[PDB]
Enzyme design. Structure first.
Site, mmCIF file in Angstrom:
data_model
loop_
_atom_site.group_PDB
_atom_site.id
_atom_site.type_symbol
_atom_site.label_atom_id
_atom_site.label_comp_id
_atom_site.label_asym_id
_atom_site.label_seq_id
_atom_site.Cartn_x
_atom_site.Cartn_y
_atom_site.Cartn_z
ATOM 1 N N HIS A 19 -1.411 1.396 7.503
ATOM 2 C CA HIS A 19 -2.007 1.278 6.174
ATOM 3 C C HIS A 19 -2.076 2.637 5.524
ATOM 4 O O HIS A 19 -2.457 3.602 6.184
ATOM 5 C CB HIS A 19 -3.438 0.713 6.294
ATOM 6 C CG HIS A 19 -4.070 0.461 4.971
ATOM 7 N ND1 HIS A 19 -3.526 -0.400 4.040
ATOM 8 C CD2 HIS A 19 -5.172 1.006 4.406
ATOM 9 C CE1 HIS A 19 -4.291 -0.396 2.952
ATOM 10 N NE2 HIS A 19 -5.299 0.444 3.149
ATOM 11 N N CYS A 75 0.801 -1.220 0.000
ATOM 12 C CA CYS A 75 0.000 0.000 0.000
ATOM 13 C C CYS A 75 0.844 1.285 0.000
ATOM 14 O O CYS A 75 0.340 2.308 -0.480
ATOM 15 C CB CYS A 75 -0.941 0.050 1.233
ATOM 16 S SG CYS A 75 -0.050 0.030 2.795
#
Lengths: 281, 75
Positions: free
Chosen positions: A231, A12
């Site tokens: 994240h 990510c």
């Protein structure tokens, strides 16, 4: 409205960064002219600027030649950004994100000493978040404002207190603001900064004599979680319509790896910005 | 010679170094002043992140050059 990117192995940090870069059409135009890693990057950004794609080939080339990381650990999108910009260099023509500062150092302890001038070159502005309304405008103002520096004085022949002042000497077509969200705690430990920092769609960089340059927000990379794990997602503008191809869309998207969703501007502005990407108006 | 490091709060510190100093040596000196372990430091000069095993002179870092220090926020 844009392809997602698969998360194969904690990627990510790459996917979020590519989503944001792909929302910077002046950067894509620079890359096209530069290519007239760059081509691997260009092909991804063209696809992401108009299904799920895989950006892992870019990571393979980076791992081969530029950045010794494994294929599956979490990484910092800002560190990847500087790997990319420094790989394009290997000044003005090689740095589409480059800001230049002219600096001056004045000795507070020796009025006769002549000031010295210096230059600083930066491909992102890594702003500090003060102790906790927190605004990006204030962090930027503080970054550019005068500061104290200790250094050897030729006239006093000892360390002395100097004031450094800065003026922006080069304005880029593309701008990356990095809100530092890791600080050092009073306990000698890292600390994630979760605080909202208010930012607008429009940003002005000041120049000499009241002149300035306006920039318009294109994307925001957001970090969720802590430094033990987290994240990255991106809020970005949709691509413009084909009938208005050089316009800027007012439709925003939330993109988390392979998932793309419409987002309101208010959701964008309410997010915890980590990297903000702008283009010069 | 002296070089400057803009630290995490924006405060700029001054280090005593030689052109032959390695990046690891420079991070140790930053650790002495700021308390940050070298494996957590990202040092940037002219947009390039400095790598362990190289020297200041490898990067053309000269007297009174300025480095920026940031940490590594992984995801």
């Amino acid at each position: 409205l844009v392809p997602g990117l698969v998360n194969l192995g904690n990627t990510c940090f790459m996917n979020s960064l590519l989503q944001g870069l792909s929302a910077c059409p002046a950067f894509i135009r620079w890359l096209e002219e530069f290519t007239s890693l760059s081509l691997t990057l260009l092909h991804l950004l063209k696809a992401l600027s108009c299904e799920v794609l895989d950006a892992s080939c870019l990571l393979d080339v980076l791992r081969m030649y530029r950045w010794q990381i494994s294929s599956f650990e979490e990484q910092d999108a800002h560190e990847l950004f500087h790997v990319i910009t420094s790989s394009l260099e290997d000044w003005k023509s090689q740095h589409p994100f480059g800001v230049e500062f002219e600096t001056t150092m004045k000795c507070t302890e020796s009025e006769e000493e002549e000031v010295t001038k210096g230059k600083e070159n930066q491909d992102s502005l890594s702003l500090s978040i003060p102790a906790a309304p927190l605004t990006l405008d204030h962090c930027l103002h503080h970054f550019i404002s005068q500061e104290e520096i200790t250094k050897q004085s030729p006239t006093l022949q000892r360390n002395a207190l100097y004031i450094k002042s800065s003026k922006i000497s080069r304005l880029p077509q593309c701008l990356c603001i990095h809100l530092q969200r890791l600080s050092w705690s009073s306990h000698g430990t890292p600390l994630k900064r979760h605080e909202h920092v208010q930012f607008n769609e429009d940003l002005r960089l000041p120049l000499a004599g009241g002149r300035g340059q306006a920039y318009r927000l294109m994307a925001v990379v957001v970090h969720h979680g802590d430094m033990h794990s987290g994240h990255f997602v991106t809020y970005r503008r949709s691509p413009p319509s084909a009938r208005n191809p050089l316009s800027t869309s007012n439709q925003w998207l939330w993109v988390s790896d392979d998932t793309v969703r419409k987002a309101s501007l208010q959701e964008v502005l309410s997010s915890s910005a980590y990297l903000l990407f702008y283009e010069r108006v | 010679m002296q070089i400057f490091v803009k630290t995490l709060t924006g405060k700029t510190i001054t280090l005593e170094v030689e052109p032959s100093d390695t990046i690891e040596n420079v991070k140790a000196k930053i650790q002495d002043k700021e308390g940050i372990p070298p494996d957590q430091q990202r040092l940037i000069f002219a947009g390039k992140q400095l790598e362990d095993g190289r020297t200041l002179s490898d990067y053309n870092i000269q007297k009174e050059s300025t480095l920026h220090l940031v940490l590594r926020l992984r995801g």
